Amino acid sequence: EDVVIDRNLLILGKILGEGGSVMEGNLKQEDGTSLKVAVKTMKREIEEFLSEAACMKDFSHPNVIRLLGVCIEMIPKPMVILPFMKYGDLHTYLLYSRLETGPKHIPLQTLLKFMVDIALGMEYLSNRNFLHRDLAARNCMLRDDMTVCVADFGPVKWIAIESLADRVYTSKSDVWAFGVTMWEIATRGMTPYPGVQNHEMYDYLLHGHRLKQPEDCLDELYEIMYSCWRTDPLDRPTFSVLRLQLEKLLESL
Ligand SMILES: NC(=O)Nc1cc(-c2cccc(F)c2)sc1C(=O)N[C@H]1CCCNC1
Ligand SMILES: [Cl-]
Ligand SMILES: [Cl-]
Ligand SMILES: [Cl-]
Ligand SMILES: [Cl-]
Ligand SMILES: [Cl-]
């Protein structure tokens, strides 16, 4: 396909993360310049892979990570090629922000803009009937301009009650993972459901218990993230409704 990149245009560097592993890289480009890339390994069957990557490579949105292509080193081991992001994942960034060494205290207006950015990304993927299935702040990347894009597309405390039960997954389960992500950002990196263990989570949710309003968090913001966890998927808003709720709340500060 036009998605496959020659292994010779790619030089692999140091390991950055674990998701097999994700590496630093140089991509040699059509214009003779080299581009900083992240290279992530993957766990025939590769035809369905290449075909999915070919599909994702057509994505174009500031708040979705570009898939620049795929390499196959040879047993074939394929590798997803992505623009390198020195600011790393959101979750780590939030934790670092609570240290004096790390980034400055993040004001709420900036925390809401992270949420708007993810909403915009998920709005765009949702429209093309693409399901993420692993939305969480650890899988949102920060670009050099500090804009957030959604990533690592294709964790029980992010799985929506209907997906825990029936092994069903719709865009509305993605909306559930989005509210948990909104909570991770409002809490600046707390694990969801403190004092509840992974095995207790289905029964905790089944008895109607939800993520608790964070201490900083605005009531209006907590109403938006609470709407993402309504029992019936059909009663949850769409990403397009959510994006505009958040855009409108951000406008009023
Ligand atoms: N694209 C890019 O630069 N990637 C990328 C870059 C990372 C990174 C960038 C600068 C410093 C550093 F320590 C890590 S980490 C990472 C990545 O893809 N992490 C994944 C691990 C699996 C779960 N979600 C985050
Ligand atoms: Cl290499
Ligand atoms: Cl950083
Ligand atoms: Cl509750
Ligand atoms: Cl909680
Ligand atoms: Cl509460």
Side-chain angles (χ1 to χ4, degrees), residues 1-166 168-253:
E1 259 291 83
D2 205 19
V3 70
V4 176
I5 291 162
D6 201 70
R7 184 57 189 79
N8 291 130
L9 298 174
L10 197 58
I11 114 73
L12 293 185
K14 310 138 63 170
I15 297 182
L16 294 173
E18 306 287 14
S21 89
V22 45
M23 293 176 267
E24 174 232 334
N26 287 351
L27 185 48
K28 197 44 167 329
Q29 271 169 318
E30 227 64 74
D31 77 346
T33 78
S34 275
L35 180 85
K36 205 70 207 167
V37 293
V39 177
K40 83 171 296 291
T41 71
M42 304 269 97
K43 309 188 184 86
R44 206 203 109 174
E45 292 106 295
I46 80 192
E47 214 173 74
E48 196 247 302
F49 182 67
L50 287 195
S51 181
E52 277 289 288
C55 171
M56 295 176 334
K57 201 188 151 207
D58 274 314
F59 293 153
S60 177
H61 206 276
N63 305 307
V64 183
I65 199 165
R66 335 212 298 284
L67 175 139
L68 297 169
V70 304
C71 277
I72 293 148
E73 227 183 337
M74 188 281 262
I75 305 96
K77 310 169 78 63
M79 306 196 277
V80 170
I81 324 306
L82 296 151
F84 177 75
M85 277 165 309
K86 55 172 194 202
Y87 288 141
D89 71 289
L90 191 56
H91 185 256
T92 307
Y93 183 92
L94 294 158
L95 292 182
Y96 281 157
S97 86
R98 297 188 55 199
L99 318 174
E100 209 66 37
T101 268
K104 205 247 206 280
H105 179 266
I106 313 164
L108 167 84
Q109 295 80 358
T110 302
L111 291 174
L112 255 186
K113 188 209 155 35
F114 292 165
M115 297 175 204
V116 167
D117 286 353
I118 298 155
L120 280 159
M122 288 302 295
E123 179 173 37
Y124 170 94
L125 290 169
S126 207
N127 284 359
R128 301 175 153 60
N129 304 275
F130 186 86
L131 303 179
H132 197 294
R133 296 194 218 240
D134 187 20
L135 190 57
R138 79 191 155 254
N139 290 347
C140 299
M141 301 305 305
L142 283 167
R143 310 165 91 211
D144 293 0
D145 62 353
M146 284 302 307
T147 296
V148 187
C149 54
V150 309
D152 282 4
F153 45 57
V156 157
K157 293 197 163 183
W158 284 260
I159 300 179
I161 190 167
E162 74 266 26
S163 298
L164 280 188
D166 312 317
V168 173
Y169 205 104
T170 82
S171 265
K172 289 220 167 295
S173 337
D174 272 348
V175 164
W176 180 294
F178 180 58
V180 178
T181 298
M182 286 179 70
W183 186 99
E184 297 187 79
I185 293 146
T187 65
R188 295 157 163 96
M190 285 182 48
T191 304
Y193 310 104
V196 175
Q197 292 213 289
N198 266 260
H199 73 261
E200 282 166 316
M201 268 304 305
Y202 181 34
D203 245 279
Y204 194 54
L205 290 177
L206 238 164
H207 281 84
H209 298 309
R210 287 306 179 269
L211 284 173
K212 296 188 285 217
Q213 164 161 22
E215 188 100 355
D216 289 71
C217 197
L218 284 180
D219 283 16
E220 295 93 291
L221 186 52
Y222 186 57
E223 279 149 29
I224 297 167
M225 61 173 82
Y226 198 83
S227 74
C228 295
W229 314 307
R230 299 195 186 125
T231 321
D232 189 342
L234 294 194
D235 288 324
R236 297 167 207 160
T238 56
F239 281 118
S240 192
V241 165
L242 276 165
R243 185 264 305 163
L244 182 53
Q245 273 161 9
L246 297 166
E247 267 180 334
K248 198 48 45 157
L249 177 51
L250 178 52
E251 187 75 79
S252 69
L253 310 164

